[PDB]
Design a protein around this ligand. Structure first.
Ligand SMILES: *[C@@H](O)C(=O)N(c1cncc(Cl)c1)c1cccc(-c2cccc(Cl)c2)c1
Ligand SMILES: *[C@@H](O)C(=O)N(c1cncc(Cl)c1)c1cccc(-c2cccc(Cl)c2)c1
Lengths: 306, 306
């Protein structure tokens, strides 16, 4: 038992992290087969970043302008191109540590592990959710650009996130690995801001099920509620609407705990209207919304990866 | 910016995880050079576990009674011995993925990353603190025995924890890698229980500094307090005493934020007496105590490992 914010083992991703330097800018790249992926703003100066014409900036670059360091081994760049907001640096060596991988784009509400790196060296791993407003509440300092977010499904790494920038509220914006930003953000220095967030309702419910599985039951009650009546309450507290598909996704957790989804919704309703009254749930005094139903099942059942 | 419960990259440890089977019991082992370390209760039946004579149980075992699987490769056991509560299985192959390592025993209040595994396969990684009562609030299901806890210092893995068992409150007890239990726990089935815990005061203060570094300041005030007067309050709220060494350890954080340690103590005092009044700190409605001053500096400054 127990419930933790658990990231995937990061080894398979660690073997892909490289250092990409262009001019005075150093950040992280992702080395898969003979390509290194990195944020295209690596080719920018500070003055460039205020109105960058990246096509202009890149045509003025040569392969030798890109220093790629894989550990203490320099990778010779033999080709470069832009794909949306990422650079693809073709290198003369295929990464022998390339895992089976996919580039997948995730949905707000889904979670992933972030391997934070600096200078191509992994620093830490932690679990993130894609907020409804397409930001992530990460932990990133200068030089973390190019750190990737990922999930692991058996032996296959699904890369979903590459870190590009921090927004003024301290949240983080980035792209999928095809270079397409999550949310309405651009890789230049504008006054862009996150935009209002909501709480991921289906995740809160999943975590309430995790709590029940782990012996926290004080928030249960005999009441039930209809989906519509719950969603009236969700709207009032800035929770996103619960759909029948969410209810279906919560079925397994419902069946394992014996608590009907709508019954758990009634419990969430009371938690929203009454607060927690000095009590905690799974060591939290807040309703946690960064565990998906899959995360709960994985952790409260015990799936591994090889 | 941002602050997350961050574990160390787990790759170096993943390459050491193996599956140890003895009879019908399967758990995880740690394969370093030509030794596999695992909980000695692997040699137990259920009936054995109620009054085990492990010396008796082990003398009745042979090398061939231990099936060690490193991935899809079977490691031939050529020797076995007990060291306290761990088994040392000598295998005919040195682990080519052996990192530089040390076996270190940690102090309550210190943190570490846990690589949760099942059947020798890494499942997830998360950050744990050694509670003052020598338990850890982990996430472990049946079959996680032998998962290890560790820290990484540049390129060297300091193994500090091997998981043995779950206590009746759902917290976890284990040994250091020399087989010596953390806390007053034994690897048999008794009525052992965790014993009362306290909150790790120096860690809470460190996290308050992390909050200030990350822009949460609402809990600051102009008041100060003496160490003695703070400790009178710490005692009342089941916080452990703050020492001058803690104050010294907090010096760097104090200097970076400009908030005197004793001033932050006055803030903690008010947080304890008044609660948080509907506000949060670093996304928590509770005072977080599983970040050490080192964890905060590492994350709020950006140290990596290679
Ligand atoms: C990489 O340079 C980097 O990691 N930056 C960073 C990312 N996340 C958090 C923090 Cl605190 C820093 C970084 C540093 C300077 C500028 C930028 C940046 C500004 C505007 C647009 C983009 Cl794509 C990047 C990012
Ligand atoms: C390994 O068997 C295992 O991982 N066990 C376990 C550990 N942590 C949490 C949970 Cl839910 C299970 C496990 C399973 C059965 C028995 C024991 C056990 C009982 C008494 C003493 C010891 Cl050392 C172990 C542990």
């Amino acid at each position: 038992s127990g419930f933790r914010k658990m990231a995937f083992p990061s080894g398979k991703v660690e073997g892909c992290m490289v250092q990409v330097t262009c001019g005075t800018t150093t950040l992280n790249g992702l080395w898969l087969d003979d390509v290194v992926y990195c944020p295209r703003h690596v080719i920018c100066t500070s003055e460039d970043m205020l109105n960058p014409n990246y096509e202009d900036l890149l045509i003025r670059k040569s392969n030798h302008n890109f220093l790629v360091q894989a550990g203490n081994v320099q990778l010779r760049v033999i080709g470069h191109s832009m794909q949306n907001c990422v650079l693809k640096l073709k290198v003369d060596t295929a990464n022998p540590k390339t895992p089976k991988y996919k580039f997948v784009r995730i949905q707000p509400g889904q979670t992933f592990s972030v391997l934070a790196c600096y200078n191509g060296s992994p620093s830490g791993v932690y679990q993130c959710a894609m907020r409804p407003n397409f930001t992530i509440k990460g932990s990133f300092l200068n030089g973390s650009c190019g750190s990737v977010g990922f999930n692991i499904d058996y032996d296959c790494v699904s890369f979903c996130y590459m870190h590009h920038m921090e927004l003024p509220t301290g949240v983080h914006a980035g792209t999928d690995l095809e270079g397409n930003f999550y949310g309405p953000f651009v890789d230049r220095q504008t006054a862009q801001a996150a935009g209002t967030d909501t709480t991921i309702t289906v995740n809160v419910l999943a975590w309430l099920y995790a709590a029940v599985i782990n012996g926290d039951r004080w928030f249960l009650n005999r009441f039930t509620t209809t989906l519509n009546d719950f969603n009236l309450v969700a709207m009032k507290y800035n929770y996103e609407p619960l759909t029948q598909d969410h209810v279906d996704i919560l079925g397994p957790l419902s069946a394992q705990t014996g608590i009907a989804v709508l019954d758990m919704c009634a419990s969430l309703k009371e938690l929203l209207q009454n607060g927690m009254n000095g009590r905690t749930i799974l060591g939290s005094a807040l309703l946690e919304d960064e565990f998906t139903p899959f995360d709960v099942v994985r952790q409260c059942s015990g799936v591994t990866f090889q």
